[PDB]
Amino acid sequence: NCIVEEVDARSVYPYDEFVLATGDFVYMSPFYGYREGSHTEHTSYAADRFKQVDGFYARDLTTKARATAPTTRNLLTTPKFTVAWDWVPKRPSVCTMTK
Amino acid sequence: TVSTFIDLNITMLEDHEFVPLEVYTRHEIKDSGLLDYTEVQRRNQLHDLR
Ligand SMILES: *[C@@H]1O[C@H](CO)[C@@H](O[C@@H]2O[C@H](CO)[C@@H](O)[C@H](O)[C@H]2NC(C)=O)[C@H](O)[C@H]1NC(C)=O
Numbered sequence: 510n511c512i513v514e515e516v517d518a519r520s521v522y523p524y525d526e527f528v529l530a531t532g533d534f535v536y537m538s539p540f541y542g543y544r545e546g547s548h549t550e551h552t553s554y555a556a557d558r559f560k561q562v563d564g565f566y567a568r569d570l571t572t573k574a575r576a577t578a579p580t581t582r583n584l585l586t587t588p589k590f591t592v593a594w595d596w597v598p599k600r601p602s603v604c605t606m607t608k
Numbered sequence: 609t610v611s612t613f614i615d616l617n618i619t620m621l622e623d624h625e626f627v628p629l630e631v632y633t634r635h636e637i638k639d640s641g642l643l644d645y646t647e648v649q650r651r652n653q654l655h656d657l658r
Contacts, residue, residue, distance in 0.1 A: 519642055519643070520642075521642050528642055528643055530647075530648070530651055531648070531651060531652055532643060532648045532652065
């Protein structure tokens with residue numbers, strides 16, 4: 510049975526790994542990639558498993574409608590699943606304080 | 609007019625209201641944990657019916 514499922518993701522400081530709504534720890538910084546020293550970030554995964562897609566276009570599975578704008582994607586294939594998430598810079602995304 | 613009196617000025621201490629204040633609410637504390645066990649369970653026990 511093929512299954513495509515959208516989930517939430519939560520990472521705590523130092524953000525070198527995160528979780529998913531199902532409870533699976535992905536051992537890779539949500540900001541690891543190829544652009545602007547993103548290879549500095551942490552991934553305990555073999556570099557072939559991670560692939561970054563510039564100018565990716567996402568098609569909805571139910572709506573069947575390509576939409577939005579180019580979103581640079583990140584894909585990491587674990588021995589049991591493959592996760593896709595939009596790569597965003599680390600500095601404007603997170604913050605150590607709270608107004 | 610000259611006066612034989614000595615002045616003294618007393619103004620009452622005005623009212624002041626204390627609004628409720630919390631640094632962290634218990635919902636933020638429940639969200640502090642990286643994995644709420646209950647929500648993970650409820651999501652993962654819907655796989656057959658989903
Ligand atoms: C008697 O009460 C206070 C001093 O304790 C004075 O009232 C204030 O005076 C300031 C200037 O010093 C004004 O800006 C305020 O409007 C006044 N009222 C309050 C509630 O602060 C008052 O002047 C004193 N009486 C005399 C004759 O000086």
